[PDB]
Structure formats: structure tokens, C-alpha cells
Amino acid sequence: RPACLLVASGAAEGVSAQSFLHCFTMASTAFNLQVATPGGKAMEFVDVTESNARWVQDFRLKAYASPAKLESIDGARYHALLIPSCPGALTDLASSGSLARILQHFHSESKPICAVGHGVAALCCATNEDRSWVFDSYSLTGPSVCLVVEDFVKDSSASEPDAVHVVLDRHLVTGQNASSTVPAVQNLLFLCG
After folding, report:
1. DSSP codes of every residue in 97-114
2. Which GO terms describe its cellular component?
3. By CB neighbour count within 10 A (0-12 exposed, 13-18 middle, 19+ buried), where does 40 fall?
């Protein structure tokens, strides 16, 4: 089993609960999984409901519910990176210089990156020295429905609001929205097979 880095938000209404549930359970079946967030701050679950409540009540009680400090992580230790749909991504992650260094590693070694829905915003942090995005020539999907970054969701793609829409370009896999979480990471799992 290889290792996979699951980065999420620590921010206020940060991470979508169903997206995360699928990322964690699905990726844990194939990887030694490691949750990481800025500052190591515990995640705040949006969209918690009667269907997933038991699971998150159990998750909060598990030893690895505590994230590692994203700033303290060596990107080289992991073969895959997975960002669930995280509404808080745009305060936490889309401005994280730590994530931009880990992403620059992953893109340089062409390692599998998977980002779903709002988590796709987290990819805007990866500015090269020339202030260009490292995912210049890449084609991606993500939410336009919802702000420090507006130009990169604009010019550097979208289908329908709640429909599963997943795009695989080389080694970058993007889900457009929370709904697309399950096929997205299955593509991730396909890349690592």
C-alpha cells in the first residue's frame, strides 16, 4: 500500500461532509491515508445530514480524525493527493504557500492529483515564479457557482449544477461538484493501479 495525502480546509464552514466521507473511505481502501489541513486545525463539516451523521459522529472519535499540519508535510512521502469538495478552500488553501510547494512537487514528478468541486479552488495557490499557474496547459472542471481568485476560475469546463462531471487530463483528475466525488476518486484510484 502506498500513501495518499488528503488535504482539506480547517476554515469556518470548510469541508463538504459527503464529499469528504467518500474521499476518506474510498482512498483508505487503497492507501495509507493522511489527512492534513492548514495549522492542523480540525475540519468543519458543511452539509451534515441524517444519512451521514452517524459516520461523522464515529469519525470525530477516531485517532486519525486529527489532521497533520499541512505546513509540516513532505510532499515526496506521498504517491497521491486528494482534495475533497471544500467550501473553505478559498480562505484556507487557495492562498497556502505550503500547498503550492507540494503541488509544484506533484506536477513536477507528474504524480496523481485529484480535486473535487470546491476543493478544485485549492489548486489556484500554485503560482510559478512568473505568476502563472502550474496547471497552465491542463483542462479542468470546477464550480463557477461560488473571493480572492476570479481570474483563474475564468481563463486558465462546466456542465450542469448537480450532474456528475469528471475530467481526467494526464495525471490531474477534477470533479466539478460534490456529486462528482465518487467517480473522481475512482479515477484517482485508476491512475494508481
Report:
1. HHHHHHHHHHHHTT--EE
2. cytoplasm; early endosome; extracellular exosome
3. middle
